[PDB]
CSV table of C-alpha atoms and ligand atoms in Angstrom, one decimal:
chain,number,residue,atom,x,y,z
A,1,UNK,CA,8.7,-22.5,11.5
A,2,UNK,CA,9.4,-26.1,9.9
A,3,UNK,CA,6.1,-28.1,8.9
A,4,UNK,CA,3.8,-28.9,6.3
A,5,UNK,CA,1.5,-26.4,4.1
A,6,UNK,CA,-1.8,-26.3,4.8
A,7,UNK,CA,-4.9,-24.2,3.9
A,8,UNK,CA,-7.1,-22.7,6.7
A,9,UNK,CA,-10.3,-20.9,6.3
A,10,UNK,CA,-11.6,-17.9,8.4
A,11,UNK,CA,-13.2,-14.3,8.4
A,12,UNK,CA,-11.7,-10.9,7.8
A,13,UNK,CA,-12.6,-7.7,9.5
A,14,UNK,CA,-15.5,-6.9,7.2
A,15,UNK,CA,-17.0,-10.4,8.0
A,16,UNK,CA,-15.9,-11.9,4.5
A,17,UNK,CA,-14.9,-15.6,4.5
A,18,UNK,CA,-11.3,-16.2,2.8
A,19,UNK,CA,-9.2,-19.1,2.7
A,20,UNK,CA,-5.4,-18.6,4.0
A,21,UNK,CA,-2.2,-20.4,3.2
A,22,UNK,CA,-1.0,-21.9,6.7
A,23,UNK,CA,1.4,-24.2,8.0
A,24,UNK,CA,1.0,-27.4,10.3
A,25,UNK,CA,3.4,-28.3,12.9
A,26,UNK,CA,1.3,-29.3,16.2
A,27,UNK,CA,-0.5,-26.0,16.1
A,28,UNK,CA,-1.4,-24.0,12.5
A,29,UNK,CA,0.4,-21.0,12.0
A,30,UNK,CA,-0.3,-18.0,9.6
A,31,UNK,CA,2.6,-19.0,7.5
A,32,UNK,CA,2.2,-18.9,4.1
A,33,UNK,CA,5.0,-21.2,2.2
A,34,UNK,CA,3.7,-20.7,-1.3
A,35,UNK,CA,4.9,-17.3,-1.5
A,36,UNK,CA,8.7,-16.0,-1.8
A,37,UNK,CA,10.6,-17.2,1.4
A,38,UNK,CA,7.1,-16.9,3.1
A,39,UNK,CA,4.3,-14.6,4.5
A,40,UNK,CA,4.6,-14.8,8.4
A,41,UNK,CA,1.8,-12.9,10.7
A,42,UNK,CA,2.3,-12.2,14.4
A,43,UNK,CA,0.0,-11.3,17.3
A,44,UNK,CA,1.3,-8.3,19.3
A,45,UNK,CA,-1.3,-9.1,22.0
A,46,UNK,CA,-2.2,-5.2,22.4
A,47,UNK,CA,1.5,-4.4,23.3
A,48,UNK,CA,4.1,-2.4,21.6
A,49,UNK,CA,6.7,-5.3,21.6
A,50,UNK,CA,7.4,-6.4,17.9
A,51,UNK,CA,6.9,-8.8,16.0
A,52,UNK,CA,5.3,-10.5,19.1
A,53,UNK,CA,4.3,-14.2,18.3
A,54,UNK,CA,3.7,-16.0,15.0
A,55,UNK,CA,0.2,-16.6,14.8
A,56,UNK,CA,-0.7,-20.0,16.0
A,57,UNK,CA,-4.3,-21.9,15.9
A,58,UNK,CA,-5.4,-25.3,17.2
A,59,UNK,CA,-8.1,-26.1,14.3
A,60,UNK,CA,-7.0,-24.0,11.3
A,61,UNK,CA,-10.4,-22.3,11.5
A,62,UNK,CA,-10.0,-18.3,12.1
A,63,UNK,CA,-13.6,-17.1,13.1
A,64,UNK,CA,-13.0,-15.5,16.2
A,65,UNK,CA,-13.4,-11.9,16.4
A,66,UNK,CA,-9.6,-11.6,17.5
A,67,UNK,CA,-8.9,-13.6,14.6
A,68,UNK,CA,-10.0,-11.2,11.8
A,69,UNK,CA,-7.3,-8.9,11.8
A,70,UNK,CA,-4.7,-11.4,11.4
A,71,UNK,CA,-6.9,-13.2,8.8
A,72,UNK,CA,-6.8,-9.7,6.7
A,73,UNK,CA,-3.4,-8.6,7.3
A,74,UNK,CA,-1.9,-12.3,6.0
A,75,UNK,CA,-4.5,-12.7,3.2
A,76,UNK,CA,-3.7,-9.0,1.8
A,77,UNK,CA,-0.1,-9.3,2.2
A,78,UNK,CA,-0.6,-12.6,-0.4
A,79,UNK,CA,-2.5,-10.5,-2.8
A,80,UNK,CA,0.1,-7.9,-2.7
A,81,UNK,CA,2.7,-10.2,-3.1
A,82,UNK,CA,0.8,-11.6,-6.1
A,83,UNK,CA,0.6,-8.2,-7.7
A,84,UNK,CA,4.5,-7.4,-7.6
A,85,UNK,CA,5.2,-10.8,-9.0
A,86,UNK,CA,2.5,-11.1,-11.8
A,87,UNK,CA,2.3,-7.4,-13.0
A,88,UNK,CA,5.8,-6.3,-12.5
A,89,UNK,CA,7.8,-9.4,-12.3
A,90,UNK,CA,9.2,-8.3,-8.9
A,91,UNK,CA,9.6,-11.1,-6.1
A,92,UNK,CA,8.8,-9.5,-2.8
A,93,UNK,CA,9.9,-6.3,-1.5
A,94,UNK,CA,13.5,-6.6,-2.1
A,95,UNK,CA,13.1,-8.7,-5.5
A,96,UNK,CA,14.7,-11.4,-3.8
A,97,UNK,CA,11.6,-13.1,-2.2
A,98,UNK,CA,12.3,-11.8,1.4
A,99,UNK,CA,9.9,-13.1,3.8
A,100,UNK,CA,7.2,-10.6,4.6
A,101,UNK,CA,6.2,-10.4,8.0
A,102,UNK,CA,3.0,-8.5,9.7
A,103,UNK,CA,2.0,-7.8,13.3
A,104,UNK,CA,-1.7,-7.2,14.4
A,105,UNK,CA,-3.2,-6.0,17.7
A,106,UNK,CA,-0.4,-3.5,18.1
A,107,UNK,CA,-1.2,-1.6,21.1
A,108,UNK,CA,-4.6,-0.4,22.3
A,109,UNK,CA,-7.0,1.3,20.5
A,110,UNK,CA,-4.1,2.4,17.8
A,111,UNK,CA,-5.6,4.4,15.1
A,112,UNK,CA,-2.7,3.7,12.5
A,113,UNK,CA,-0.4,0.8,10.8
A,114,UNK,CA,3.1,1.5,9.4
A,115,UNK,CA,6.3,-0.2,8.3
A,116,UNK,CA,8.9,0.0,10.7
A,117,UNK,CA,11.9,-1.0,8.6
A,118,UNK,CA,11.6,-4.4,9.0
A,119,UNK,CA,7.8,-5.4,9.0
A,120,UNK,CA,4.3,-4.1,8.6
A,121,UNK,CA,2.5,-3.3,12.0
A,122,UNK,CA,-1.6,-2.7,12.3
A,123,UNK,CA,-3.3,-1.3,15.3
A,124,UNK,CA,-7.2,-2.3,15.9
A,125,UNK,CA,-8.4,1.3,15.8
A,126,UNK,CA,-10.5,2.7,18.5
A,127,UNK,CA,-13.6,1.3,17.1
A,128,UNK,CA,-15.1,5.0,16.4
A,129,UNK,CA,-12.2,6.7,13.8
A,130,UNK,CA,-10.9,3.2,12.8
A,131,UNK,CA,-11.7,-0.4,12.9
A,132,UNK,CA,-8.8,-3.0,12.5
A,133,UNK,CA,-6.6,-1.2,9.9
A,134,UNK,CA,-5.5,-4.7,7.9
A,135,UNK,CA,-9.1,-4.7,7.1
A,136,UNK,CA,-8.1,-2.3,4.0
A,137,UNK,CA,-6.4,-4.0,1.0
A,138,UNK,CA,-5.1,-0.4,0.1
A,139,UNK,CA,-3.7,-0.1,3.6
A,140,UNK,CA,-2.0,-3.1,3.5
A,141,UNK,CA,-0.7,-2.7,0.0
A,142,UNK,CA,0.3,0.6,1.0
A,143,UNK,CA,2.5,-0.5,3.9
A,144,UNK,CA,4.0,-3.3,1.9
A,145,UNK,CA,4.9,-0.7,-0.9
A,146,UNK,CA,7.0,1.5,1.9
A,147,UNK,CA,9.2,-1.4,2.0
A,148,UNK,CA,9.5,-1.7,-1.8
A,149,UNK,CA,10.5,2.0,-1.9
A,150,UNK,CA,12.8,1.4,1.2
A,151,UNK,CA,14.8,-1.2,-1.1
A,152,UNK,CA,14.6,0.7,-4.4
A,153,UNK,CA,14.3,4.7,-4.6
A,154,UNK,CA,14.8,5.0,-0.7
A,155,UNK,CA,12.7,8.2,-0.8
A,156,UNK,CA,13.6,10.1,2.1
A,157,UNK,CA,10.5,10.5,4.5
A,158,UNK,CA,10.6,14.2,4.8
A,159,UNK,CA,9.6,17.3,2.7
A,160,UNK,CA,8.8,16.7,-1.1
A,161,UNK,CA,10.8,13.4,-1.2
A,162,UNK,CA,8.6,12.1,1.5
A,163,UNK,CA,5.4,13.1,0.0
A,164,UNK,CA,6.4,11.2,-3.3
A,165,UNK,CA,7.1,8.4,-1.0
A,166,UNK,CA,3.6,8.5,0.4
A,167,UNK,CA,2.1,9.0,-2.8
A,168,UNK,CA,3.9,5.9,-4.6
A,169,UNK,CA,2.3,4.0,-1.5
A,170,UNK,CA,-1.1,5.4,-2.2
A,171,UNK,CA,-0.6,4.9,-5.9
A,172,UNK,CA,0.4,1.1,-5.7
A,173,UNK,CA,-2.2,0.5,-2.6
A,174,UNK,CA,-4.8,1.7,-4.9
A,175,UNK,CA,-3.5,-0.5,-7.8
A,176,UNK,CA,-3.7,-3.6,-5.6
A,177,UNK,CA,-7.0,-2.8,-4.9
A,178,UNK,CA,-8.0,-2.8,-8.4
A,179,UNK,CA,-6.0,-5.7,-9.2
A,180,UNK,CA,-8.0,-7.8,-6.6
A,181,UNK,CA,-11.3,-6.2,-8.2
A,182,UNK,CA,-13.3,-6.0,-5.0
A,183,UNK,CA,-15.1,-2.7,-4.7
A,184,UNK,CA,-12.0,-0.8,-6.0
A,185,UNK,CA,-12.1,3.2,-6.0
A,186,UNK,CA,-9.2,6.0,-5.9
A,187,UNK,CA,-9.8,6.4,-2.0
A,188,UNK,CA,-7.7,5.2,0.7
A,189,UNK,CA,-8.9,3.4,3.5
A,190,UNK,CA,-12.4,3.5,3.0
A,191,UNK,CA,-12.9,-0.2,4.2
A,192,UNK,CA,-11.5,0.9,7.8
A,193,UNK,CA,-12.3,4.5,8.4
A,194,UNK,CA,-15.1,5.6,10.5
A,195,UNK,CA,-17.3,2.7,10.8
A,196,UNK,CA,-20.3,5.1,11.9
A,197,UNK,CA,-20.1,7.2,8.4
A,198,UNK,CA,-20.6,5.8,4.9
A,199,UNK,CA,-18.8,7.2,2.1
A,200,UNK,CA,-16.0,8.8,3.4
A,201,UNK,CA,-12.2,7.9,3.7
A,202,UNK,CA,-8.8,8.9,4.8
A,203,UNK,CA,-7.5,10.6,1.6
A,204,UNK,CA,-8.8,11.2,-2.2
A,205,UNK,CA,-6.7,10.5,-5.1
A,206,UNK,CA,-9.0,11.7,-7.8
A,207,UNK,CA,-9.8,14.8,-5.7
A,208,UNK,CA,-7.6,15.4,-2.6
A,209,UNK,CA,-9.2,18.3,-1.9
A,210,UNK,CA,-12.2,16.6,-0.8
A,211,UNK,CA,-10.5,16.1,2.4
A,212,UNK,CA,-8.5,19.4,2.6
A,213,UNK,CA,-5.1,17.9,0.8
A,214,UNK,CA,-3.6,20.0,-2.2
A,215,UNK,CA,-4.3,19.3,-5.8
A,216,UNK,CA,-1.8,21.6,-7.1
A,217,UNK,CA,1.8,22.6,-6.4
A,218,UNK,CA,0.5,26.3,-5.6
A,219,UNK,CA,-1.4,25.1,-2.5
A,220,UNK,CA,1.4,22.9,-1.0
A,221,UNK,CA,2.2,22.9,2.7
A,222,UNK,CA,5.3,24.3,3.6
A,223,UNK,CA,5.6,24.1,7.2
A,224,UNK,CA,6.8,21.2,9.4
A,225,UNK,CA,3.9,19.3,10.6
A,226,UNK,CA,3.7,15.8,9.4
A,227,UNK,CA,7.3,15.6,8.4
A,228,UNK,CA,6.4,18.5,6.2
A,229,UNK,CA,3.2,17.3,4.9
A,230,UNK,CA,4.4,14.0,3.4
A,231,UNK,CA,0.6,12.9,4.1
A,232,UNK,CA,-0.8,16.4,2.7
A,233,UNK,CA,1.5,17.0,-0.3
A,234,UNK,CA,1.1,13.7,-1.4
A,235,UNK,CA,-2.2,14.8,-2.9
A,236,UNK,CA,-0.7,16.7,-5.5
A,237,UNK,CA,1.0,13.7,-6.9
A,238,UNK,CA,-1.8,11.3,-6.2
A,239,UNK,CA,-3.6,13.8,-8.2
A,240,UNK,CA,-1.4,13.7,-11.1
A,241,UNK,CA,-1.5,9.7,-11.0
A,242,UNK,CA,-4.9,9.8,-11.1
A,243,UNK,CA,-5.0,12.0,-14.5
A,244,UNK,CA,-2.5,10.2,-16.1
A,245,UNK,CA,-4.6,6.9,-15.6
A,246,UNK,CA,-8.2,8.4,-15.9
A,247,UNK,CA,-7.6,11.5,-17.8
A,248,UNK,CA,-9.5,14.9,-16.9
A,249,UNK,CA,-9.2,18.6,-16.9
A,250,UNK,CA,-8.0,20.1,-14.0
A,251,UNK,CA,-7.1,23.8,-13.6
A,252,UNK,CA,-7.9,24.1,-17.3
A,253,UNK,CA,-5.3,21.7,-18.1
A,254,UNK,CA,-6.6,18.6,-20.3
A,255,UNK,CA,-5.2,15.0,-19.8
A,256,UNK,CA,-5.6,12.0,-21.9
A,257,UNK,CA,-6.1,8.9,-19.7
A,258,UNK,CA,-4.1,6.1,-20.6
A,259,UNK,CA,-5.6,3.6,-17.8
A,260,UNK,CA,-4.3,1.8,-14.8
A,261,UNK,CA,-1.9,-0.6,-16.0
A,262,UNK,CA,0.1,1.9,-18.0
A,263,UNK,CA,0.2,4.2,-15.2
A,264,UNK,CA,1.8,1.4,-13.1
A,265,UNK,CA,4.2,0.4,-15.5
A,266,UNK,CA,5.5,3.9,-15.5
A,267,UNK,CA,5.5,4.6,-12.0
A,268,UNK,CA,6.9,1.3,-11.3
A,269,UNK,CA,9.9,2.1,-13.9
A,270,UNK,CA,10.4,5.6,-12.5
A,271,UNK,CA,10.3,4.2,-8.5
A,272,UNK,CA,13.3,1.2,-9.6
A,273,UNK,CA,15.2,2.8,-12.3
A,274,UNK,CA,15.3,6.9,-11.9
A,275,UNK,CA,13.8,8.2,-8.5
A,276,UNK,CA,16.8,8.8,-5.6
A,277,UNK,CA,16.4,9.3,-1.9
A,278,UNK,CA,16.4,13.1,-2.5
A,279,UNK,CA,14.1,13.3,-5.3
A,280,UNK,CA,11.4,16.3,-5.6
A,281,UNK,CA,8.5,16.8,-7.5
A,282,UNK,CA,10.2,18.5,-10.5
A,283,UNK,CA,12.6,15.3,-10.5
A,284,UNK,CA,9.7,12.9,-10.2
A,285,UNK,CA,8.2,14.5,-13.4
A,286,UNK,CA,11.5,13.8,-15.1
A,287,UNK,CA,11.7,10.5,-13.9
A,288,UNK,CA,8.0,9.5,-14.7
A,289,UNK,CA,8.7,11.4,-18.4
A,290,UNK,CA,11.7,9.3,-19.0
A,291,UNK,CA,10.1,6.1,-17.9
A,292,UNK,CA,7.0,6.6,-20.3
A,293,UNK,CA,9.7,7.4,-23.1
A,294,UNK,CA,11.7,4.4,-22.5
A,295,UNK,CA,8.5,2.2,-22.5
A,296,UNK,CA,6.3,3.6,-25.2
A,297,UNK,CA,8.4,6.1,-27.1
A,298,UNK,CA,9.3,9.9,-27.0
A,299,UNK,CA,6.3,10.8,-29.4
A,300,UNK,CA,4.0,8.5,-27.8
A,301,UNK,CA,0.5,9.5,-26.2
A,302,UNK,CA,1.8,8.1,-22.7
A,303,UNK,CA,4.5,10.4,-22.5
A,304,UNK,CA,2.2,13.3,-23.7
A,305,UNK,CA,-0.1,12.4,-20.9
A,306,UNK,CA,2.4,12.4,-18.2
A,307,UNK,CA,3.4,15.8,-19.0
A,308,UNK,CA,0.1,17.2,-19.0
A,309,UNK,CA,-0.8,15.5,-15.8
A,310,UNK,CA,2.1,17.2,-14.0
A,311,UNK,CA,1.4,20.3,-15.9
A,312,UNK,CA,-2.2,20.2,-14.3
A,313,UNK,CA,-0.8,20.1,-10.7
A,314,UNK,CA,1.6,22.8,-11.3
A,315,UNK,CA,4.9,20.8,-11.4
A,316,UNK,CA,7.3,21.7,-14.1
B,1,0A9,C1,9.6,-29.2,20.4
B,1,0A9,O1,8.5,-28.5,21.5
B,1,0A9,C2,8.2,-27.4,21.7
B,1,0A9,O2,8.7,-26.5,21.0
B,1,0A9,C3,7.3,-27.0,22.8
B,1,0A9,N1,7.4,-25.3,23.0
B,1,0A9,C4,5.9,-27.5,22.8
B,1,0A9,C5,5.6,-26.9,21.2
B,1,0A9,C6,5.5,-27.4,20.0
B,1,0A9,C7,5.2,-27.3,18.9
B,1,0A9,C8,4.5,-26.0,18.8
B,1,0A9,C9,3.8,-25.4,19.9
B,1,0A9,C10,4.5,-26.0,20.9
B,2,CA,CA1,-9.2,-21.7,15.4
B,3,CA,CA1,-12.4,0.2,-2.2
B,4,CA,CA1,-9.6,2.5,-1.7
B,5,CA,CA1,-16.4,5.3,7.1
B,6,ZN,ZN1,2.7,5.7,4.1
């Protein structure tokens, strides 16, 4: 909407207070005009019609329980935008400052979140499996990264290309979490998963097997569930990424870590320059090797570590 840029304050899902960029015109809207062509957050009102109504608030204070998922979807979308701009010189998900739109309070007891081709969408969870999913910065960045992939490699969402699509979202979701530097880890969804169980998460990148996911290509899922295992076989790529960054010895293959920033540079270049809609794991390895060569040289340690990481997870 047309109005003047303002700054509100509220409380997120985890009870933390944060300032949020809003817009004033009679009401205060969750519309952040300081980033690109705007970040817009909507109320889906427990229904499934999208996007719902642009979030309006009478006093620019967002401390009601009902407000909390909106606060975090809006704030964490901004942080993710900042990451892509400041770290990779990418302006929003299309590279052209496209408006970023999110809906919260999607459906009733909905234990998921997703990118629907046009916007991000967050359930509130059922209170036992999940609390409102926009409470996880890695969740928000995972979803916005799906948009980035849609506009770049376009990885089809099934089988190996879909597991790469998923792993890209977990990788950059995690790198955004580290960027924001609030309780960062290599786990996915720990801030919103199972409020009655401490220490768990939905997925682990450092040890995918902790939650049953494969950490070696020989252990890949080959059936048809989950679009052919896109959230399962992502563990193979997530482990490789973790090893590129942090190092380790895995199935007897030793990897010298090169750190998160170089991981991000290599996989961002692969995503935006070399991957295609039908890329499989072996092609992802080639894309990462070429990206690391581009950035650091064919004889670099970075190239050597990419190769060792993919060797360690059985991807030639
Ligand atoms: C111009 O009047 C309108 O658009 C009316 N819907 C009143 C309204 C104004 C601004 C914000 C919300 C409601
Ligand atoms: Ca208010
Ligand atoms: Ca964390
Ligand atoms: Ca995490
Ligand atoms: Ca938990
Ligand atoms: Zn995903």
